[PDB]
Amino acid sequence: GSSGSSGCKLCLGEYPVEQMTTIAQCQCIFCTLCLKQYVELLIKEGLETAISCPDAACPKQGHLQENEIECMVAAEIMQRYKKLQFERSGPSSG
């Protein structure tokens, strides 16, 4: 049977499982490249830390854990997200 390529719903491009990342939240796979630009573009902003799914048509609307991002982006970048997390912590409990 045919297998190997998982395809992408972001850049509409085909890529090997080698350069892809399967989200263990919404069984959503995407090419590192995209996922990288996605989580990055978001963090870079500095308004929201939670890295939702890069898919607008996600019935599960999963999120991207920290572990994923950590690797996805580089230390220099991660930091930006790391600080963003704290900013939004215990909005009720002090």
Two tokens, residue 10: 């972001």
> How far apart (Å, rounded) are the C-alpha atoms in residues 46 and 57?
24
Tell me if 31 is assigned to a ligand binding site.
Answer: yes
Give the residue with the Cβ less far from Zn ion, 28 or 42: 28
From residue 46 to residue 85, the character string flagging contacts with Zn ion as x (rule: CB under 5 A) and all else as - is: -------x-x--x---x-----------------------
- Pair 60, 25: CB distance under 8 Å: yes
Tell me if 8 is assigned to a ligand binding site.
Answer: yes
> How far apart (Å, rounded) are the C-alpha atoms in residues 25 and 11?
21
Q: In the range 15-44, which residues lie near Zn ion by CB under 5 A?
A: 26, 28, 31, 34
